[PDB]
Design a protein around this ligand. Sequence first.
Ligand code: NI
Length: 341
Amino acid sequence: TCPFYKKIPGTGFTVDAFQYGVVEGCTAYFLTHFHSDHYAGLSKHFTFPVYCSEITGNLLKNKLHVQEQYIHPLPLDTECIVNGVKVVLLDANHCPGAVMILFYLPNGTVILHTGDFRADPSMERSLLADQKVHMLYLDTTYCSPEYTFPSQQEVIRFAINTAFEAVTLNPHALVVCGTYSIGKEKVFLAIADVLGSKVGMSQEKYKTLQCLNIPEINSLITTDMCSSLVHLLPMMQINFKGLQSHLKKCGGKYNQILAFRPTGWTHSNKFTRIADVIPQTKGNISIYGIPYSEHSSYLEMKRFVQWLKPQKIIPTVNVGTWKSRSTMEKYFREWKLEAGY
Ligand code: NI
C-alpha cells in the first residue's frame, strides 16, 4: 500500500508510486526521473497514464517497453492542464530528465514536489519566484550538517587534470569509469574530451545514453571498445579483481588502469579536501573515489528552503526511522526560526 508522502491531496495524483499495484483513486501517475527506486513496478503491461519529462518518456518506451499510448511527456517551464489541474515541470538538477513538479490545487493551495534534486541558486529565478508555495515534498537525502561536498565543477576539474596527467605520462594507460544508473555522465564525457577519445561501453549502456537528448552525442560515445581509451564498466567491477580481468581482455594494448568511482558522500569528506584526494593502488591499478553528488548538500538544501519559505515540509527520504525523522524536524524548526517565516 502506497505511503501518504507519495499522494498529492485534493487530486487524483501520485508521485513515484508504481510498486503498489492499482492505487485506489489514482487517475494519473507522475514519474520524476528514471532511477529504479522511483520507477519500481513499471513495465510493458502498465495501462494507466504516466506523466513525465520527454527524456524520461524516451527511457520508459525504449528500456522498459511501456506502450506509447500511455506515455504523456510534458515540456519544461510550461503551464499544462492534467485532469483538470494546472501543473508545471521544472529542472531538478539531478540526472538527465529529472523534474520537480508544481501543482496548483483547485482550492488555491500550491504544492512543490522536488523529486530527487540538487538545490541551486538558479532555481530562485525559475517560475518558483512568481507565487507562494504552501507545502514542500522535499528530497532530504543529505539533511544533516556533516554532509559537505565540493561543487560539481571542482570535482570535474580534479578528474580531467588527473586523467590528462596520467595518460600524458603513460600513453599506454587506460581510463575506466564506473556506472549503474543514469546520472553523472559529465565525469566520463569530460575525461574523454580532454584525451581526444570517444567513450567505449556495452550495447545496453549505449542504448540508454541514446535516449538522453545530449547534443552531439554520436560524436562522443561508441560501442567499439578497441577504438576508445576511456571505458565504462558496471560499478560492481570497479575493484582490483574486476579491473585486472578487464585489462587481460584488452590484448596487451594497455599496461596500466586509472579508474574512477563517482560516489555520493563518503566519511573521507569530513577530513579531506578535493585537492588532497589520493587513490587506492595495487600494482599497475589505481582507483579514485570522487564525491560527485546529484543531491543537495546540507547548506544548499537549507538555502533553498529558507528562500522558498514553505508553510509545511514533508520529507521523502530518510523517513523509516524515528531518529532520522526527529533530526530532520529539528533542522526544519531551526531554519524557520533563523529566517523568521
Ligand atoms: Ni534519484
